[PDB]
């Protein structure tokens, strides 16, 4: 039947309350179900959340749980997928092209009627609130935030009995940030999309004063915190003249501004919460490359008795491309797959390679692109060595600057060059 969007603001009790409700009425419904969770870490906890019922986390169940990216990848690689009666889709405004992809691909299926879906999220796609309501009153700061190491100044960081979370827009400002704290005595974690199994679990087990993040938080994390420090930046991707480049500080959404913000009052009793915030925030994102690779995406997904699906209705603005634009051959198909799925290269960069008609074993295409595409970090080239042992400096023929745009990328991209993978 329906598409229901269901906007409960953070602390509402989405995974605690309101989803075991849903999941609860859905079994006793006797609907095939799939619980869409944005990450690994999030599908972790909303399985603890649902102990007692019969939940197939990827005897007998009518109720499957995956991550958003894990589900449209399945898609991508035709290997078959539940015909199932209701998808919930977990922090459905997530921008991951995966995520994307997956709401154009579910509001198709209800669409033709096949099933109905649920989408959750405090901010729903197509609004725009960055000051959402919260369990307790926030106390909205606006200030001066720096952006890098300081000698002085910004006493009102330092001269705070309680715990805060400091987003930043890369690891290397969170590095620079967090020392800076160090040295003024605070006991800090750091927080990364590497570094969360392992340092997450210490919000808790240990004390600290300070978490730095990237916007690996923005979801996925419950603190017990008292304030939030957020100069709303990032850094993103953008395509254009035939090569993605990495752009920022730029303001960040007002979605993100909001879960960032929701980190702080969700507990009803405790009055003092703040959100320490500058800069303003922005919904003119369509030169992001997201929305091009959500259709890259989409546009090698069959659906079954239907034609290519577009993307979820109030995002099919962020898009000039025509439907099948990006299609592709079969055995081109299954390379796009692979160098995303096991290479782990960005949509983007995948596809072109794909669509070049490179095999997915031949790694030259890293090596033999214009002197123009020669990779540059800490302003030196990156030698590598291939399998046989050779002298090669990375230099692709498709320029994709999330390649070097951190050092996690940069040693999956130099493994990937290498024939790792």
Known sequence: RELTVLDLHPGAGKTRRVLPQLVREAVKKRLRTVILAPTRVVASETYEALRGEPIRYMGNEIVDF?????????????????????????????????????????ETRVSMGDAGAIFMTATPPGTTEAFPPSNSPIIDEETRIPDKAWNSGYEWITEFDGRTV?????????????????????????????????????????????????????????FKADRVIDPRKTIKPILLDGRVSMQGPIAITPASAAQRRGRIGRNPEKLGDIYAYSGNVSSDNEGHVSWTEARMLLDNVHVQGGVVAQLYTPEREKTEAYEGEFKLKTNQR??????????????????QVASANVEYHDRKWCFDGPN???????????????????????????????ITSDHLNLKSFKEFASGKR
């Open 372 to 402: 123009e595409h020669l990779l540059l970090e800490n302003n030196q080239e990156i030698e590598v060595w291939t399998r046989q042992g050779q002298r090669r400096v990375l230099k692709p023929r498709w320029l994709d600057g999330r």
């Open 66 to 106: 995956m991550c958003h990216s894990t589900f449209t990848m399945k898609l991508l690689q035709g290997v078959r997928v539940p015909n199932y009666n209701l998808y919930i889709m977990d922090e459905a405004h997530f921008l991951d092209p995966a995520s994307v992809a997956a709401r154009g691909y579910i």
């Open 166 to 222: 400091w987003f930043v827009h890369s690891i290397k400002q969170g590095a620079e940030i967090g020392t800076c704290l160090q040295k003024a005595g605070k006991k800090v974690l750091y927080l990364n999309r590497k570094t969360f199994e392992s340092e997450y679990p210490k919000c808790k087990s240990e004390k600290w004063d300070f978490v730095i993040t990237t916007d690996i938080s923005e979801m996925g994390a419950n």
């Open 334 to 351: 299954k390379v796009f797959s692979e160098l995303i799925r096991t290479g782990d290269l960005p949509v983007w960069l995948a596809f």
